[PDB]
């Protein structure tokens, strides 16, 4: 006739309970806004002694991040930006780049930046270079053309990869992850679409920037960046060619966030800051919503 004190979940909580015998009610919340549940999160005691919940019976909710959403609305020709514009911003520090947090284990980067280091050190939530994450495996898009050597490269194509981390990230203010393209065509840019680009790559006045920057650019027609030997394909955007604003050495791996077409308030990657051929002009980004597929399969793969 006792159920006891519930168990507690990670990321989310139970509401003091009115009481633990048969027929209470308890209810678990998820840790908002940074989780959401994956119910109603509702349980009754049982008169066999389990809580129980009409969807999950026994089994305990799982409390889920809430990707895309910053917690507040916001590098060549960029201005400051705080960590809690682009809390899914992750930094590398060998090389200096940058990456995006995709879900509590998993990080999306260019291949470029994880080519030579399969090990990469990560840290997340700070605005300034100045959270650690481990990596437990780095995942190479196999289109990815491997070089004896890497300086000098001329083919960029499909320039991404995936982090798997050793353990779940905490959600927060300054860390979150940011939604994936969906695979349908109201995920195809159009010259014009506006995105953001976030990093402590080069600036206009310093190599690199100790506090992140951001900027919002257009996608443009390819033709754009070719006018600007260098590989150029399908799975690669190009934005840019205003106000000479662009992304330069060190940005690289970062999200081209866009505003998600079926919801207004979220952002998902379209892009990822891959190269270009000149900094503070138009800058190629290799094109997410090509990639989805290989994102999803290698993530079931190795969960
Ligand atoms: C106790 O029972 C639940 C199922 O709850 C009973 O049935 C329910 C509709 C509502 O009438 C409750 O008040 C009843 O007590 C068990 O739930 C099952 O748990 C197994 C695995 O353990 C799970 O495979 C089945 O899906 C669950 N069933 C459904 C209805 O939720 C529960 O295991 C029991 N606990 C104990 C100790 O035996
Ligand atoms: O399996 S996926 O990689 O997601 C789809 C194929 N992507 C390519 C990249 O060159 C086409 O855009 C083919 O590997």
């Given at each position: 006739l006792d159920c006891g004190i519930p168990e507690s979940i990670e990321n989310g909580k139970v509401e003091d309970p009115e009481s633990t015998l048969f027929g209470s009610v308890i209810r678990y919340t998820c840790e908002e806004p940074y989780y959401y549940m994956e119910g109603g999160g509702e349980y009754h005691c049982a008169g066999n002694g389990s809580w129980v919940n009409?969807?999950?019976?026994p089994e305990l909710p799982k409390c889920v991040p809430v990707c895309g959403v910053p917690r507040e609305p916001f590098i060549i020709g960029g201005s400051d930006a705080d960590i809690?514009?682009?809390?899914?911003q992750v930094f590398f520090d060998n090389p200096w780049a940058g990456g995006a947090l995709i879900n509590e284990y998993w990080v999306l980067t260019a291949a470029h930046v994880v080519e030579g280091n399969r090990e990469p050190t990560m840290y997340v939530?700070?605005?300034?270079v100045q959270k650690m994450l481990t990596p437990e495996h780095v995942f190479i898009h196999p289109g990815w053309k491997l070089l004896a050597?890497?300086?000098?490269?001329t083919n960029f194509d499909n320039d991404i990869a995936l982090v798997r981390l050793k353990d779940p990230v905490k959600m927060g203010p300054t860390v979150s992850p940011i939604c994936l393209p969906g695979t349908?065509?109201?995920?195809?840019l159009m010259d014009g679409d506006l995105g953001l680009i976030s990093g402590w790559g080069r600036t206009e006045k310093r190599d690199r920037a100790v506090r992140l920057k951001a900027a919002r650019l257009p996608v443009a027609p390819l033709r754009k960046c070719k006018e600007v030997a260098y590989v150029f394909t399908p799975n690669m955007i190009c934005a840019g060619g205003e106000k000479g604003m662009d992304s330069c050495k060190?940005?690289?791996?970062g999200a081209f966030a866009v505003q998600d077409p079926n919801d207004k308030t979220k952002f998902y990657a379209?892009?990822?800051?891959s190269w270009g051929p000149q900094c503070g002009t138009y800058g190629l980004y290799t094109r997410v919503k090509n990639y989805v597929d290989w994102i999803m399969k290698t993530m079931q793969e190795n969960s």
């Amino acid at each position: 006739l006792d159920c006891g004190i519930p168990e507690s979940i990670e990321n989310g909580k139970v509401e003091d309970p009115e009481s633990t015998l048969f027929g209470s009610v308890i209810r678990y919340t998820c840790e908002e806004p940074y989780y959401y549940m994956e119910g109603g999160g509702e349980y009754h005691c049982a008169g066999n002694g389990s809580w129980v919940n009409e969807v999950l019976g026994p089994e305990l909710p799982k409390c889920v991040p809430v990707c895309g959403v910053p917690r507040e609305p916001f590098i060549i020709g960029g201005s400051d930006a705080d960590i809690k514009n682009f809390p899914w911003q992750v930094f590398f520090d060998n090389p200096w780049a940058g990456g995006a947090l995709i879900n509590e284990y998993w990080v999306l980067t260019a291949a470029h930046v994880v080519e030579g280091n399969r090990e990469p050190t990560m840290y997340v939530g700070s605005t300034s270079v100045q959270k650690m994450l481990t990596p437990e495996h780095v995942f190479i898009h196999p289109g990815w053309k491997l070089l004896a050597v890497p300086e000098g490269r001329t083919n960029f194509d499909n320039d991404i990869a995936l982090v798997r981390l050793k353990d779940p990230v905490k959600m927060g203010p300054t860390v979150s992850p940011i939604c994936l393209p969906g695979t349908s065509s109201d995920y195809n840019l159009m010259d014009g679409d506006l995105g953001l680009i976030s990093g402590w790559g080069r600036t206009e006045k310093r190599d690199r920037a100790v506090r992140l920057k951001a900027a919002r650019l257009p996608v443009a027609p390819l033709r754009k960046c070719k006018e600007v030997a260098y590989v150029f394909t399908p799975n690669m955007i190009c934005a840019g060619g205003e106000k000479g604003m662009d992304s330069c050495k060190g940005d690289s791996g970062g999200a081209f966030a866009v505003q998600d077409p079926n919801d207004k308030t979220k952002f998902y990657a379209a892009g990822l800051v891959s190269w270009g051929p000149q900094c503070g002009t138009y800058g190629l980004y290799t094109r997410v919503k090509n990639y989805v597929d290989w994102i999803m399969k290698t993530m079931q793969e190795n969960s």
